[PDB]
């Protein structure tokens, strides 16, 4: 049925109790629990509606079960109403769903109040009732939804609900591009450094580690993350979910920490350049990246596979047990423990050592007025690094801290978006740390093959 699909993209789906536009406790696919501000009253109504102790959380099956009931209860409410029934009978299948939509939203006795537009609706004068419905509180309260229902009423088509498919297939396109950019980018980088011995420097050994983490992310994390979002489900095991999210945290931790290692690498190459090649050896270099991945392993696979990350609230417990749920619920402890160890500590180090580099550049910039190309290009690169890095990961790791401190603040969608903003940073890294003339030559050679 189309009325079922229509309401699914009008009410969405939330397995936990939330507040709708009017501030009423709602759950599932737009099922009003109570018009009272009492959470306990809402939780009691949910328990009665489902038939078990819910803790404010239901399942997807229980959501569609309540959904089908609410739709049926709306149709019955129309047929029993003596002012709505002649209109419903008059309307076609598509326009019927539009009427069911309003009743689903405002109730049978609430829709019946629209005397003027109900008349114009039965008279089949669509364009009249179209602008007549716009002059109501229902339109002012929910502008985006009312326009979709009114459009369906005056056209008799589903063109108003055709946007959802466009944004999905469009998002599927841009996700494919991201995956392609990350893989093509980092493969080209790792290949170039490996094949050509001239590029194998101490600094560029760190970039290989970075490009490796970024590569695995573009191969393992991002593609399966795109499928999880587009299909709106997880078509793999609970094992594969716990394995996939491990690679997520592992690669992110490795990627960000390696960015920090590069930063400290340049710190010694700028502040104490005469000791640089003595402090940082090829041997010490691989020792550092060993520690990076060793650490990253202890923040990803160890806490996750041992179920130390797991939260304790009901929605998490249901998610962990559901073979089609792969939402990343974490306890407050692991969240802030993994956040500081995979971002904030690298951040404060990165800001410190780059502040010092900023000083050393400005200091030399004061000595001579012209021909300061080295310091100018340093400052410019310095901006691009801290710019794209913080702009990509800081918002995510801010809301990552917030959502485990005060819930009902950070939405699911915005956690995903800001996390994917961090994902594309893996695609940006080959555009930042591989700009050298020797990289450009190595790239024009591999692509000319």
């Amino acid at each position, epitope marked *: 049925g189309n009325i079922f699909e229509m309401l699914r993209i009008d009410e969405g789906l939330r397995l936990k109790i939330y507040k709708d536009t009017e501030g009423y406790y709602t759950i599932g696919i737009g099922h009003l629990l109570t018009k009272s501000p009492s959470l306990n009253a809402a939780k009691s109504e949910l328990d009665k509606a489902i038939g078990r102790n819910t803790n404010g959380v239901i399942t997807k099956d229980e959501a569609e079960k309540l959904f089908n009931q609410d739709v049926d209860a709306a149709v019955r409410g129309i047929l029993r109403n003596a002012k709505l029934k002649p209109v419903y009978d008059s309307l076609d299948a598509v326009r019927r769903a539009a009427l069911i939509n309003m009743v689903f939203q405002m109730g049978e006795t609430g829709v019946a109040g629209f005397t003027n537009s109900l008349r114009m609706l039965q008279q089949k004068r669509w364009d009249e009732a179209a602008v007549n419905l716009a002059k109501s509180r229902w339109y002012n309260q929910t502008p985006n939804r009312a326009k979709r229902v009114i459009t369906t009423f005056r056209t008799g088509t589903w063109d108003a609900y055709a946007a959802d498919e466009v944004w999905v297939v469009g998002m599927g396109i841009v996700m494919s591009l991201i995956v392609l950019a990350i893989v093509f980018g980092n493969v080209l980088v790792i290949t170039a450094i490996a094949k050509f011995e*001239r590029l194998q420097t101490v600094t560029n050994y760190f970039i290989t580690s970075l490009a490796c983490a970024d590569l695995v992310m573009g191969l393992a994390v991002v593609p399966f993350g795109a499928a999880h979002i587009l299909t709106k489900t997880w078509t793999f095991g609970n094992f594969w979910c716990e394995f996939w999210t491990s690679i997520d945290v592992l690669c992110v931790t490795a990627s960000i920490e390696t960015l920090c290692v590069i930063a400290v690498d340049r710190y010694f190459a700028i502040t104490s*350049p005469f000791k640089y090649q003595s402090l940082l050896t090829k041997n010490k270099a691989r020792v550092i990246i060993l520690m990076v991945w060793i650490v990253s392993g202890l923040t990803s696979f160890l806490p996750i596979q041992m179920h130390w990350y797991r939260a304790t609230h009901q929605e998490a417990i249901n998610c962990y047990a559901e073979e089609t749920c792969c939402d990343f619920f974490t306890n407050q402890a692991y969240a802030i423990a993994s956040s500081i160890v995979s971002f904030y500590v690298p951040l404060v180090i990165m800001v410190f050592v780059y502040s010092r580099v900023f000083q050393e550049a400005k200091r030399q910039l004061q000595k001579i007025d012209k021909f300061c190309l080295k310091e100018h290009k340093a400052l410019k690169t310095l901006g691009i690094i801290m710019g794209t890095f913080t702009l990509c990961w800081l918002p995510f790791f801010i809301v990552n801290i917030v959502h485990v401190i005060q819930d009902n603040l950070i939405r699911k969608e915005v956690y995903i978006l800001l996390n994917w903003i961090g994902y594309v940073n893996s695609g940006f890294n080959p555009l930042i740390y591989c700009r050298s003339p020797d990289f450009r030559i190595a790239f024009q050679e591999l692509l000319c093959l």
Partner: nanobody
Amino acid sequence: QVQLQESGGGLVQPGGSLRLSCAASGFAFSSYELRWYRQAPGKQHELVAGITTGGNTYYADSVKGRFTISRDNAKNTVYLQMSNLRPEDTAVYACNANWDLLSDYWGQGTQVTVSS
């Protein structure tokens, strides 16, 4: 990998002259900015001379007029001809090629000691 080897340092009478050579191998030399740095014992390192890709040379106030830096792209070598040397010029002189923040390569550095 990238390599910068200095040669031409050592001992020299005060007022004497030395010529530092810096051989480069492993990168696109011609499109790199070259500088000569030095570091006296127990002191902060300082810039001696520098030459751009265009050929623009710039020097420190203390060695201006005495030292002369030049570059040979055909041989991937940058030189630092330094005359009228002084006991203050006694330091470890290092070669440095640079493109951006990450493409910054240094030499091992050669010791120049000036005394009578």
